[PDB]
């Protein structure tokens, strides 16, 4: 197998892993490797239909974004079938570490589909995951793990009153510009967009971004992406929530601001809870240092 390095941008639908490289040049690149030799669930999703989680789907994804999310891992390619390339991933700069479908499988959170010293060892995991009666191996059916996912709350400003600007946990699902988020709001399972109160950064069109667009997307994707935060729902914008997302590495409203990635916006500073000072302070400390979109050149 010839091996390689990465770093974990997300779990998909599956358990297909986003693996990305350090960014030389532009955005990182990104590669989609499938687990080789096993099932899980498919998340929810929608087109035609709404259609919900499969049973074990979702506690699946959680444990290996628990688990991996921003790890260095390590990766072979097993196959590329005809473009989708399916593999093993390690967690560890090297080899022998913890295999991932190893770790899933042994939860009851996949099993294998319809031999070697490889899947020996999975069959085993299998067998003491069926032994112990994890995951989907439990006596039942598994409907408890599947989420009453809503994809629009039913009145925003109701919904925004009803938290009291109290935060409320929250996942990071998508960043589709550097100021905004999809955000899966727990325990209810809300999957809405979030805007940052108070700022907007550079956004994309057409076939061509605005400049530092790609720059900010990754920014915040990076520090935050598939992350466990909390966010105060501070007001809506359609069926869009206004809001400021809480983790404990810091406020990202107030660094994009501060590493020249986003400019105050005036309609929505007065809802910003955290103070509206300390934005337009932030702003200036990266105007006064010239920084990227405060650059003479750009
Ligand atoms: C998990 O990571 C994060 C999640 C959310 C936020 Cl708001 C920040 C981070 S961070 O720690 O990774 N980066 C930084 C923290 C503090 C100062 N700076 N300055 C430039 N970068 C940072």
Known sequence: P?????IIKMVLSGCAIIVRGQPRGGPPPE??????????????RRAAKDTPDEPWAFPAREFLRKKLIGKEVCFTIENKTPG????????????NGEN??????????????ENNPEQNRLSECEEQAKAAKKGMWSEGNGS?????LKYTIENPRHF?????????????????????????????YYLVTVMLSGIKCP????????????????????????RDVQIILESCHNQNILGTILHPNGNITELLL??????????????????AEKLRAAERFAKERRLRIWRDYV
């Open 100 to 113: 991932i479908a190893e770790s899933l499988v042994a939860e009851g959170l996949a099993t294998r589909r």
């Open 160 to 188: 925004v009153d009803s938290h009291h600007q109290k935060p409320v946990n929250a996942i990071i699902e998508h960043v589709r510009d550097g100021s905004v988020v999809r955000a899966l709001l727990l325990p209810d």
């Open 203 to 226: 956004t994309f069109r057409r076939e061509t971004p605005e400049p530092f667009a790609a720059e900010a997307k990754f920014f915040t994707e990076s520090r935050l992406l598939q």
């Open 84 to 95: 989708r390339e399916y593999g093993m991933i390690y967690l560890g700069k090297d080899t």
């Open 258 to 275: 501060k590493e020249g990635f986003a400019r105050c916006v005036d309609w929505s500073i007065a809802v910003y809870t955290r103070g």
């Open 31 to 44: 590669r989609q490797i499938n687990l080789s030799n096993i099932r899980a669930g498919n998340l929810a």
């Open 2 to 6: 010839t091996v390689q390095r990465g």
């Open 144 to 148: 408890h793990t599947i989420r009453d």
